[PDB]
Structure 1
Amino acid sequence: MYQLHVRVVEAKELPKMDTFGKCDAFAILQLNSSRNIHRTKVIEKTYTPVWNEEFHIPLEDVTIDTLTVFLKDEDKGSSDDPISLIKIPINQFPLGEVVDKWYSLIPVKGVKKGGQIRLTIHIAPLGATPFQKTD
């Protein structure tokens, strides 16, 4: 069996949500359409949030599983306000490798830019140290 270790590192080039503030961003991770849904903290008033948060998500089938990453602005009267999202196929990560890179979030309709998000992703067997190359 395999575990998905995802470090939601940081994002940049976020849009200004509304005329007062910059952005109060957090990310949501979801495996497939399952109840494995995780949320980062909110970083207030910045276009360059750094979360550096690790999540450990059991995988069902590395050949077909998908990770959706949603970037949203904290609720200010209208529920969490969507910014952008990306759907990442798990089968593109070589097993055991710690893959650190940037992803281009697709802005939702009405949002002026989607931001870019840095994720460090490691698919490993149970018992392997998360975020270290699995020999």
Structure 2
Amino acid sequence: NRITVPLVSEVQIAQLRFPVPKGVLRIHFIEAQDLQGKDTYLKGLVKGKSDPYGIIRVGNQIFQSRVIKENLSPKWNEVYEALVYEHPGQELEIELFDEDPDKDDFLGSLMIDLIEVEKERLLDEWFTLDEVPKGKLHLRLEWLTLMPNASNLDKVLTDIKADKDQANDGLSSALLILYLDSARNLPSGNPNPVVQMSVGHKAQESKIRYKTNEPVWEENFTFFIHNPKRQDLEVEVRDEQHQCSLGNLKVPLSQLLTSEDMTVSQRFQLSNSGPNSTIKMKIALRVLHLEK
């Protein structure tokens, strides 16, 4: 005969690791001057119709500028946003081409070291193009860091408004980083649950889970955010089998602006779902900031 007291505690069985951006590089693709024109043997009629455009690379992210026609001093005035991760020796790569009817001619290249850009926070400079006889490109580079509070949001939003360079998909004042853990007690008692997350027009999807009302995903996602004060995270759970909804969740990102470290982590009640139907997530907001 015994009286038994079990000594139980929470133990870390394992650990998921996901990459996170070290920051956001805002790239102003402004203009070039004195680019290489098209060669001829003797001088003649015409000078050669050059139509420059640029390809910009940061890691896996690629950006393509507009083609401006018949001009060796192109003026694009465009702006792109690239996520930057820890990756030693990583560079901003730029190649300029002439849009031709056949093979597009090469108009020069540029390779800038990021950890140099990070160090400078803000550049606004002319660079002499590499691998060409002549040509210079005008860039303005902003290295933006992640802040764990909304104290400076108001100013970046006004800067976004004042910035008049062309942005294909607008500019961002924040990143949304979230962890999709699992869901409980989904409808019917099975479906093949899949989650679709969106902020406005940005959309991303989880993997499919099969024949379960208790799906586990353990996936992480990152979204560019235009304006947290306005935008909602929309979460829809669907049955891949029958393409219908299993419930959804709308989360105004403004709620995060007033939370500790702008992060909430909880079980969320699903609407348009069963009773006690829920989804477990972590959701964090980080405001993009240019400091000195």
TM-score tier after normalising by the smaller chain length: 0.7 to 0.9
Partner residue of 1:101 out of 266, 272, 289: 266
Partner of 1:82: 245
Partner of 2:150: none
Q: Does the CA-based 8 Å contact 1:83-1:114 persist in structure 2?
A: no
> Which secondary structure state, in structure 2, belongs to the residue aligned with residue 54 of structure 1?
strand
Partner residue of 1:52 out of 218, 243, 246: 218
Amino acid at match of 1:9: D
Q: Distance in 2 between matches of 1:66 and 1:87?
A: 6
Q: Percent identity?
A: 21
1:18-29, aligned counterparts within 5 Å? 22-29=190-197
Question: Higher helix fraction: Structure 1 or Structure 2?
Answer: 2
Structure 2 gaps, min length 5: 1-172
Partner residue of 1:70 out of 236, 242, 253: 236
Q: Distance in 2 between matches of 1:53 and 1:98?
A: 17
Q: Distance in 2 between matches of 1:125 and 1:23?
A: 38
Q: Does the CA-based 8 Å contact 2:238-2:245 persist in structure 1?
A: yes
> Which secondary structure state, in structure 2, belongs to the residue aligned with residue 96 of structure 1?
helix
Partner of 2:204: 38
Map Cα deviations across residues 86-121 of structure 1 (whole Å, 9 max, x no partner).
21100001373332111111126xxx5572001100
Give the number of equivalent residue pairs. 115
Partner residue of 1:116 out of 254, 278, 282: 278
Map Cα deviations across residues 36-70 of structure 1 (whole Å, 9 max, x no partner).
11110111111111101111001011111101100
> Which secondary structure state, in structure 1, belongs to the residue aligned with residue 261 of structure 2?
coil
Q: Does the CA-based 8 Å contact 1:107-1:114 persist in structure 2?
A: no
Q: Distance in 2 between matches of 1:95 and 1:113?
A: 30
Does 2:191 align with 1:14?
A: no
Structure 1 gaps, min length 5: 128-135
Cα distance, 1:6 vs structure 2? 1.2
Normalised by the size of structure 1, how large is the TM-score? 0.76
Q: Distance in 1 between matches of 2:252 and 2:263?
A: 15
Cα distance, 1:7 vs structure 2? 0.9
Normalised by the size of structure 2, how large is the TM-score? 0.37
Cα distance, 1:126 vs structure 2? 5.0
Cα distance, 1:16 vs structure 2? 1.6
Partner of 1:130: none
Query: Which protein, 1 or 2, shows the higher relative CO under an 8 Å CA cutoff with sep ≥ 6?
Result: 1
Larger gyration radius, structure 1 or structure 2: 2
